[PDB]
Amino acid sequence: GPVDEIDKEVKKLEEEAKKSQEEVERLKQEVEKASKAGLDHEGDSRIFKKIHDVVTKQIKVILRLIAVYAELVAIIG
Amino acid sequence: SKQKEAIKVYLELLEVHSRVLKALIEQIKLFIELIKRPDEDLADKVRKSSEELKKIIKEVEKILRKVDDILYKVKS
Amino acid sequence: SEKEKVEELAQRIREQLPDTELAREAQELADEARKSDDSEALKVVYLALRIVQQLPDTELAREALELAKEAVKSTDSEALKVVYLALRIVQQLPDTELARLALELAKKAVEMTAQEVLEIARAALKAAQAFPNTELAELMLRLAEVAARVMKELERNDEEIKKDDESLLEDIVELLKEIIKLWKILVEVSDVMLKLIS
């Protein structure tokens, strides 16, 4: 059924969101450690690249969850 | 100097969206349960999750004001 | 018998309008659809031509012709599905806010290369098709548009980081603004859902 498919997709997206949260934690620790090890201009640029990658993945997960939300609202009306 | 502040802003945004994810998944699960069976108890929990989402929105607005102050300091 | 439907509709358009930009662009759509072998694109062209027939010399008809051109030029089937849903919304209710929302949402979805944007746009368009002529449908289409704009702002942020502190701060503010708007629209939709369930 449609609700069963949505529930399967929701479980998969929840696992993906947990992975993204782990990425967020590791990125925070890495930023703190790199700040303690020596901040640099090019180092700031590298940190920016990594942070943007993490933000992109998180926003994609959010948009997938919002699309499932829209499909669910369409179903329930 | 400003790049470090942008780093901290992006980290705060990440930490906020991490809780946004939990709240939104809670709301989706509650909606699925409501579609499965109509229960009055579930409406209160949906409202509670919505209130949590509103508080998160307030936090994001606080971050926006913090960045607006830096914009004022930089431009002028 | 879809190709014959498109041909007869084009003939009707030719009969109705002479030496008009709508008619020339309809003939251009006709040849681009005859050359195309995709059935979804044929259906989208049919829908756009019928909309132009129903509302001649109108803003909606011209914008829908240009949107159908942009959709045929794109080789992505998901964009064609999104454009078909939006043009169906326009066909059902032309003089409504949902028509404008769907037109602009499809116009932006044709440009977007992100698959998540296309998926959320399709979801919102099917949600509007489910319960049309409602406040919730307008809120849904606006939410999809705001999500697409968030993706565009992230693209801008990346491209500016690759290459300016004031510009970075300006773009961060412009991103957070639309983020707050997206979450506000989501909260409003959740409130309407709470009231519909109770």
Author numbering:
A (entry chain B): 1 to 77
B (entry chain C): 2 to 77
C (entry chain A): 1 to 163, 168 to 202
The paper states:
We designed helical heterotrimers with specificity conferred by buried hydrogen bond networks and large aromatic residues to enhance shape complementary packing. Crystal structures of a helical bundle heterotrimer and extended versions, with helical repeat proteins fused to individual subunits, showed all three chains assembling in the designed orientation. We succeeded in determining three high-resolution structures for DHT03: the original base construct, a one-arm version (1arm_A21/B/C) and an elongated two-arm version (2arm_A21/B21/C long). We show that computational design can create cooperative ABC heterotrimers that can assemble as free-standing helical units or as hubs in larger designed assemblies.
